[PDB]
Design a protein around this ligand. Sequence first.
Ligand SMILES: C[S@@+](CC[C@H](N)C(=O)[O-])C[C@H]1O[C@@H](n2cnc3c(N)ncnc32)[C@H](O)[C@@H]1O
Ligand code: NA
Length: 273
Amino acid sequence: KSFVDRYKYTEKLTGLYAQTLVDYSGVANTSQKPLIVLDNACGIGAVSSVLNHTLQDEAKKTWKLTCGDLSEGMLETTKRRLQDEGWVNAETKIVNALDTGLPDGHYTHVFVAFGFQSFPDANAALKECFRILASGGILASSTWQNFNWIPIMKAAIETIPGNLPFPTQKEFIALNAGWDSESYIQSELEKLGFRDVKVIPVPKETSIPIDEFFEVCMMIIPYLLPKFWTEEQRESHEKDVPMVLRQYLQDTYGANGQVPLEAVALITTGLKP
Ligand SMILES: C[S@@+](CC[C@H](N)C(=O)[O-])C[C@H]1O[C@@H](n2cnc3c(N)ncnc32)[C@H](O)[C@@H]1O
Ligand code: NA
């Protein structure tokens, strides 16, 4: 369980990628046909809010926005936002991304902003996206790749004698093989028939307090070091890693007790032929 697998550190960040996801989808580009859009797992409607502010009035006269989610509590909040912000031709309703009950070939755009990693069956949800998309429809999703926490841990390991092996941020990711992977997403989309698939990484800056950053690292090294250090290296150093890291973190970030850190989301786009 990494930092991006913890709701504590990602809940506050998902809103930062809503505008990004809308821009990459291309939805704001003028098109001939009317827009029929599904904000799948819309939550508090982060994407829907952006859509309504980004789209000009002419495209909104003829479009239909559906905000789907399985939580009534979040739909209650989203319908009040729909009202306050003056969304046009927008609706809220219960929609199971696993089993949407929505028509075949009906939507020009399906948005899934940080949903696939929450679904108990992401493959079922992806096939539903494909089914309900019309010809020429666009699937646009955002998912978590990682926090760039390896270089900080690495800087601490570097201070121990023995020039000890340790993965780069990339190598640790390949230990991990799902929607946090560009190659995996491209393959899963292309299998179902999506074309022109693009998976782009997008970084945003966040920070984690020293105390919590340390605790998470300590939950991970029991798995990570045995894979990279030999028995002899572990016997000499492994027990010292905790105090080394805590010392590094205090020396480096003790002034304000916060670890600056980059969060990377993957923006995915694909076209139903
Ligand atoms: C991390 S939030 C993302 C919310 C919003 N899309 C955003 O950009 O922040 C995940 C959302 O997916 C919803 N969800 C989880 N399982 C679902 C399912 N099977 N069908 C529809 N929504 C689901 C949850 O209710 C939650 O609001
Ligand atoms: Na992470």
